[PDB]
Amino acid sequence: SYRHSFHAGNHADVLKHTVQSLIIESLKEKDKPFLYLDTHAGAGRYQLTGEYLEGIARIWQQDDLPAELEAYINVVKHFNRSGQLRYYPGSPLIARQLLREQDSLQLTELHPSDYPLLRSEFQKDSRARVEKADGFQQLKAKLPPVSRRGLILIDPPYEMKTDYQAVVSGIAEGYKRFATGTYALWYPVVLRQQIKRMIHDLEATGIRKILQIELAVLPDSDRRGMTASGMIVINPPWKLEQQMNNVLPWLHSKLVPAGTGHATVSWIVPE
Ligand SMILES: *CCCN(CC[C@H](N)C(=O)O)C[C@H]1O[C@@H](n2cnc3c(N)ncnc32)[C@H](O)[C@@H]1O
């Protein structure tokens, strides 16, 4: 039975899957195949009361949906053709629906209950390989892709402050093996100081061309839980900065009617 999740489809998922879909659509502009590598792939889909009421529900049926959200929202509608929100597609299903016949998917998830669900989403998809394995080890084992093109999505649990260091080390290892790939790292903002230190750690790797996309629903706080989330993109498609500048004001206005927080795009390290 599909996994239920109180947080699925919230503002952070909206931002993460919007960015994912735009990167995939840019990669599809060239006919050459590419790899989609999902290090922390989850269950695949989520059965939706819940934070989706403040996230995807606020945008998916809007008449003025920006063109930059059409690919993502059309996947959500594919899984909800009745017009009632019942299922939220995870990053693996976004990729399954947007990738072309010549592209490849490599998905990993250690969760003992969610790995079987993920496997069942791809049992009839010959483009995909699903493994019950550590996500960061895939940045060593699966890179570089034989196709020499790819999006690597890194979407891990952040459960203590050593995890923030593990993500940067993992990315450095992937980048050493595949310096031209696009790496998209999702992060939460609970304590801003922890994100500031992670970003410094990422800069200290020497990797260039790192874009930061962040959407906050509340100002930074000491005891409000997750107030924001973002995507750090290494080697973003050239269009992505402008696409996010086009869509972030609309997205923030729909996700946060009270107008609190912010939505920004900027460079951590330039080319
Ligand atoms: C940041 C947590 C995201 N994670 C993967 C989501 C996937 N990329 C998507 O876009 O749909 C959520 C799923 O990861 C698995 N998981 C395993 N262990 C945890 C912990 N400790 N916290 C959260 N998530 C965990 C689950 O399958 C989640 O649904």
Side-chain angles (χ1 to χ4, degrees), residues 3 13 16-17 20 38 40-44 46 89-92 109 111 114 153 155-159 186:
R3 176 69 57 242
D13 282 349
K16 176 181 45 165
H17 294 144
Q20 181 195 351
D38 200 325
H40 301 289
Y46 296 91
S91 61
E109 178 50 59
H111 194 287
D114 292 353
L153 170 73
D155 185 21
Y158 295 85
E159 302 208 308
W186 180 85

Side-chain angles (χ1 to χ4, degrees), residues 13-29 31-51:
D13 282 349
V14 170
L15 182 70
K16 176 181 45 165
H17 294 144
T18 289
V19 170
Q20 181 195 351
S21 70
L22 288 167
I23 292 166
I24 285 173
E25 294 296 283
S26 278
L27 284 170
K28 286 162 63 180
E29 292 172 12
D31 203 76
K32 276 321 193 153
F34 65 91
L35 173 67
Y36 173 77
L37 178 60
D38 200 325
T39 60
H40 301 289
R45 85 171 70 199
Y46 296 91
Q47 187 161 333
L48 301 169
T49 294
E51 294 190 343

